[PDB]
A = this chain, B = another copy of it.
Amino acid sequence: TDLDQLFEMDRAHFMHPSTHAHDHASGALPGRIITGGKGIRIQDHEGREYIDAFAGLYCVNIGYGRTEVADAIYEQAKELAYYHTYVGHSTEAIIELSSRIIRDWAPAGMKKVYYGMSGSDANETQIKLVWYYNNVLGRPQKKKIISRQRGYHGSGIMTGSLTGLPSFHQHFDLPIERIKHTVCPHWYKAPAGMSEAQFVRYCADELEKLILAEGPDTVAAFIGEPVMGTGGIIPPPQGYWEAIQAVLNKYDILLIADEVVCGFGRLGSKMGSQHYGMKPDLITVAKGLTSAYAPLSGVIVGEKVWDVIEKGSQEHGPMGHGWTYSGHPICAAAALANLDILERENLTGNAADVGAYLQQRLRETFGGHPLVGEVRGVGMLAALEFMADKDARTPFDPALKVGPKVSAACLEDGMIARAMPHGDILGFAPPLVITRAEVDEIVGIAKQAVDEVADEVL
């Protein structure tokens, strides 16, 4: 009957992202259908309600059930759901969005926006532009891209290669050539006894060593999230970005700021770049761009790169780059309504204020908890990393599944917080509309779940 037939269809015909193919198909990993939501709460097919303390995947930033955004999508869909943006074609919506992103949200020196539908396709565009940039400048060898261990930049062949987490590489023959990875800037896991400043110098020196080992004239760009998202909610050490940028300047290497997660208020600033004083040449956005109301990505191109793009076109004609759905009208309309709401409600300010409250409440609650090795985060991102031996920084045996168990316990108590991959880490990325009262409720549920698992394993 109805729901049972839907789950049967799901098992038989729907290949999910990031889902154990056989267990899901067999029914051992049970399906869940989401039927609605409002604010920070979602509802499933059994009528159970959950506090979504992960905002989908760091993306439902204005919260669920915004009929204002639905209306805007509808209006555009009625007027003109689609035409292409090839050979200088546009809608009013995509033009207004481009101007608004550059004028109101992007850091200084940014000029143009190129649109796709995912964070992954945006980073794909980024590498194409970096390679084109160097070819038109007469530097055919200057092509390598430096990423970082535990960075997350997407799930394709090139983009999965940028990504620094092994599950995105396994059985896909990644990373492909030209992509290198430097160190994860996680001070908690630094060589023992290193101060924060020593650790920063270590990260800068290791970057330099890698650049010199590869040949600086062969290295084109460096890509990094301001704060690492999927690699575990890892804020950089104090002074990290200034030290990295001095190395990149020395060897004439472009900085790509991956703002897929950090963009559009998530850290309590416009983007992560402004938050940390980064000066990127190229910026990747998605997620909070539309609050996931529709799929849209952006590549924000600085003046320096844009100027060379123009020159390339003068010498060689139009660049061979386009997606059919680049600048999709309904997606642009969703973004505009999303920005209106972020601005009108000052959700960047709410993220800074309530986010700091979240940071503080998690430190007070879990700072001395025997299961918790580190409490970390910034703005509206936070995490608890679970360790078997706190003082030595000895992780649990992965087979124990401490992280997933904490997450599952939260879920039983009606709260969604993610077991982050490749470690034992509980992650929080709530919608930016969250209140202090809602934070207290999330923290209390997390506390119970962490206590419960601590009893089982300690």
Chain A contact residues, CB within 8 Å of chain B: 6, 9-10, 12-25, 29-37, 42, 56-57, 59-60, 64-67, 69-71, 73-74, 77-92, 94-96, 98-99, 101-102, 111-114, 116-121, 124, 127-128, 131-132, 135-136, 143, 154-158, 160, 165-173, 176-177, 286-287, 292-295, 299, 301, 306, 309-314, 316-328, 330-331
- B15:A313 contact, CB within 8 angstroms: no
- B84:A17 contact, CB within 8 angstroms: yes
CB distance from A33 to the nearest CB of B (A): 5
**Residue among B42, B74, B89, B101 making CB contact with A34, cutoff 8 Å:** B89
**Dominant SS among interface residues on chain A:** mixed
| Contact of A170 with B320 at beta-carbon distance under 8 Å, contacts A15-B113, A36-B79 already known | yes
In the complex the two chains form, what is the Cα distance from A6 to B99 in whole Å? 9
**Residue among B37, B86, B136, B327 making CB contact with A57, cutoff 8 Å:** B86
- B311:A22 contact, CB within 8 angstroms: yes
A–B Cβ pairs within 8 angstroms, 16 of them:
A13-B101, A15-B114, A18-B318, A21-B319, A35-B80, A36-B80, A60-B82, A73-B73, A81-B294, A118-B324, A119-B324, A121-B156, A170-B316, A292-B324, A293-B330, A295-B328
- A135:B34 contact, CB within 8 angstroms: no
List B contacts of A86 (CB < 8 A).
16-19, 57
| Contact of A57 with B324 at beta-carbon distance under 8 Å, contacts A22-B310, A22-B314, A87-B18 already known | yes
| Contact of A88 with B19 at beta-carbon distance under 8 Å, contacts A77-B69, A112-B13, A124-B156 already known | yes
In the complex the two chains form, what is the Cα distance from A13 to B96 in whole Å? 9
**Residue among B35, B131, B286, B317 making CB contact with A324, cutoff 8 Å:** B286
Closest to A314 in B: B22
CB distance from A80 to the nearest CB of B (A): 5
Determine how many copies of this chain the complex contains. Answer: 2
CB distance from A204 to the nearest CB of B (A): 29
- A69:B98 contact, CB within 8 angstroms: no
CB distance from A140 to the nearest CB of B (A): 8
Closest to A176 in B: B176
- B19:A318 contact, CB within 8 angstroms: yes
List B contacts of A131 (CB < 8 A).
171-173
- A313:B17 contact, CB within 8 angstroms: no
CB distance from A15 to the nearest CB of B (A): 4
- B113:A13 contact, CB within 8 angstroms: yes
- B321:A88 contact, CB within 8 angstroms: no
In the complex the two chains form, what is the Cα distance from A17 to B33 in whole Å? 36
- A17:B95 contact, CB within 8 angstroms: no
CB distance from A61 to the nearest CB of B (A): 11
In the complex the two chains form, what is the Cα distance from A80 to B41 in whole Å? 11
CB distance from A93 to the nearest CB of B (A): 10
| Contact of A95 with B132 at beta-carbon distance under 8 Å, contacts A15-B301, A292-B324 already known | no
- A325:B124 contact, CB within 8 angstroms: no
- B33:A91 contact, CB within 8 angstroms: yes
List B contacts of A292 (CB < 8 A).
81-82, 324-325
- B17:A321 contact, CB within 8 angstroms: yes
Closest to A13 in B: B98
Closest to A21 in B: B313
In the complex the two chains form, what is the Cα distance from A30 to B313 in whole Å? 16
- B35:A79 contact, CB within 8 angstroms: yes
- B21:A310 contact, CB within 8 angstroms: yes
- A34:B80 contact, CB within 8 angstroms: yes
List B contacts of A155 (CB < 8 A).
320-323
| Contact of A73 with B330 at beta-carbon distance under 8 Å, contacts A34-B91, A35-B80, A312-B21 already known | yes
List B contacts of A119 (CB < 8 A).
323-324
- B83:A73 contact, CB within 8 angstroms: no
- B117:A82 contact, CB within 8 angstroms: no
Closest to A320 in B: B167
In the complex the two chains form, what is the Cα distance from A324 to B55 in whole Å? 12
In the complex the two chains form, what is the Cα distance from A378 to B136 in whole Å? 40
In the complex the two chains form, what is the Cα distance from A120 to B155 in whole Å? 13
